[PDB]
Here is the input.
Amino acid sequence: GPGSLTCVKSNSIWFPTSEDCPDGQNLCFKRWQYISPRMYDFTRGCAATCPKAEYRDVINCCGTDKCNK
Amino acid sequence: APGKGPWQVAFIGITTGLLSLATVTGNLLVLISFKVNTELKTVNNYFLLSLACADLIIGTFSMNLYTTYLLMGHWALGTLACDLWLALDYVASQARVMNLLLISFDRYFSVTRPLSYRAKRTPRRAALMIGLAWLVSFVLWAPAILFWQYLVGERTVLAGQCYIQFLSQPIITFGTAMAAFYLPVTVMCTLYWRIYRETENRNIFEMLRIDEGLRLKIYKDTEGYYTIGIGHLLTKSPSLNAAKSELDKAIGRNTNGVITKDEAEKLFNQDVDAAVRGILRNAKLKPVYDSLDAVRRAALINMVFQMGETGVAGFTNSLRMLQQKRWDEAAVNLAKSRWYNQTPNRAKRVITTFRTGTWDAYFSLVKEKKAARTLSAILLAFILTWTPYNIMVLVSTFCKDCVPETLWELGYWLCYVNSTINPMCYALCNKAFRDTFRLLLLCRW
Ligand SMILES: CC(C)CCC[C@@H](C)[C@H]1CC[C@H]2[C@@H]3CC=C4C[C@@H](OC(=O)CCC(=O)O)CC[C@]4(C)[C@H]3CC[C@]12C
Ligand SMILES: CC(C)CCC[C@@H](C)[C@H]1CC[C@H]2[C@@H]3CC=C4C[C@@H](OC(=O)CCC(=O)O)CC[C@]4(C)[C@H]3CC[C@]12C
Ligand SMILES: CC(C)CCC[C@@H](C)[C@H]1CC[C@H]2[C@@H]3CC=C4C[C@@H](OC(=O)CCC(=O)O)CC[C@]4(C)[C@H]3CC[C@]12C
Ligand SMILES: CC(C)CCC[C@@H](C)[C@H]1CC[C@H]2[C@@H]3CC=C4C[C@@H](OC(=O)CCC(=O)O)CC[C@]4(C)[C@H]3CC[C@]12C
Ligand SMILES: CN1[C@@H]2CC[C@H]1C[C@H](OC(=O)[C@H](CO)c1ccccc1)C2
Here is the structure.
């Protein structure tokens, strides 16, 4: 949004919440982190830069209100 | 970019179709041989039938779809096929461990409650046990794997992948390993440990059962004294009214002269623990009991059960020979005893028990060692194919990344190999499956 930016917030397997981005973080990320073959740790939130995508990671970035749903 | 795969996936990919066929055919044999042969219909094998049903689902659906997913690197069968594959795999795997619990407890209650538990050990109640085990396995995993995405309102599983959505957190996979594997394995190991020590007591029960008799109602013994159960003297008073009151003292219930099957076992355990405790407090019987093996300690417990601690301690030469491991020479001395001349055949059975070191004078124990070996095989085959993956998920939770990807695929795969070798254990352990499989494969039914 213009000035303000709210991302979906998720660090667990339960219902997601919403986070108001602090100044300097203008992106919403949706991040699947690889640990073991069928294991992907799923996180959603706000960030200043997109996290580094390692081997077998899938990361989606965007700058719209709640675009990482 | 070309992908250079490891030799492990080549190993998994080629042999999976071959092991899938071996799993389904071997598990169809136990299924059909159970229907063709009415003699295989023993309560022990009914549990094995439920394991084979779980092994059949793994060999038909779980094993093949795993290897397609492994070899393609993604799930191309849609979102619904993923949920069904995960459900069928986890429910069947949970039914396996739930069954292995039932088999373990069944041996435990059969040995610790020989008269009580086997009294109600019918092919009908074992069906309820198998039915409930498959029911709880379904209710735990099936509605959760299929409908968790509908509960949280979103499907967060990666689009090209296939896994349980509510285990998509590393700490949760640790807890599931502890609760679904490590907790059931520890209780099975403790049950397996207790069975080893309790079967000695089970044999003493059957030993004394034929020597001392078994009656649930008060009766006069060979000396005219009122007795109930396995040689439990109630009173030496001529009035049976004292016998009823003494029975009401040991059993906190208005017995009116009769006890139940459970109550008989409790009196036997109290009397045999008092017998072995009388052995331990005696300085003459302390060394000989410790030195002897399980079968000969049972014969010593028999004599103490019959006469008493101070009665058996008088046989100084015989005890001095049993501690000295001179069995044939000690057998002729106890024949010289007044004990030998008074009881007709109990003494001779106890004598042959010392010199032979076997139970041959009482029973054979060839059928029960066979079933115990069948138990030991299915548990050990479960441990050797499931702990690798589970010690990996353990170290994966603490160590960041030090278990290779090739080992995960092997360990995950090795759990499937358990389903392939259960029929092999059956034909190797039970010689009735072995022969019934031969007439089915050669078309001789
Ligand atoms: C009659 C058939 C159905 C039974 C045998 C089937 C499999 C058990 C065999 C067939 C081809 C064999 C494979 C042939 C070649 C190799 C490569 C070999 O690679 C190495 O030795 C070093 C590898 C490296 O350094 O990268 C490891 C064993 C393996 C996978 C073999 C494993 C066992 C396989 C899959
Ligand atoms: C379709 C997928 C999702 C699951 C397939 C599971 C089958 C392998 C299970 C489900 C119902 C089971 C059957 C349900 C009840 C019986 C009766 C039972 O009959 C007896 O043992 C009594 C003696 C006799 O009739 O011969 C034999 C096993 C059998 C056929 C079971 C065999 C294995 C079955 C077919
Ligand atoms: C398809 C998946 C999800 C469930 C598979 C369930 C089977 C593994 C369970 C459910 C019904 C159970 C059967 C239901 C009834 C019987 C008959 C029962 O036979 C007797 O009671 C002996 C006396 C008589 O034959 O009447 C022995 C257990 C058995 C085979 C049970 C064995 C295990 C079965 C097949
Ligand atoms: C179904 C039964 C009757 C026959 C199939 C037996 C297999 C399940 C056994 C037999 C040979 C075993 C394998 C022999 C050698 C190894 C190498 C061993 O070490 C390595 O893989 C090297 C480290 C690495 O490169 O990752 C890991 C286990 C494994 C695959 C063993 C896993 C279990 C195997 C495949
Ligand atoms: C889907 N898993 C099951 C069958 C193949 C994989 C590997 C095994 O995973 C487990 O051992 C875990 C516990 O660590 C488990 C999950 C559900 C039931 C029993 C065991 C069972």
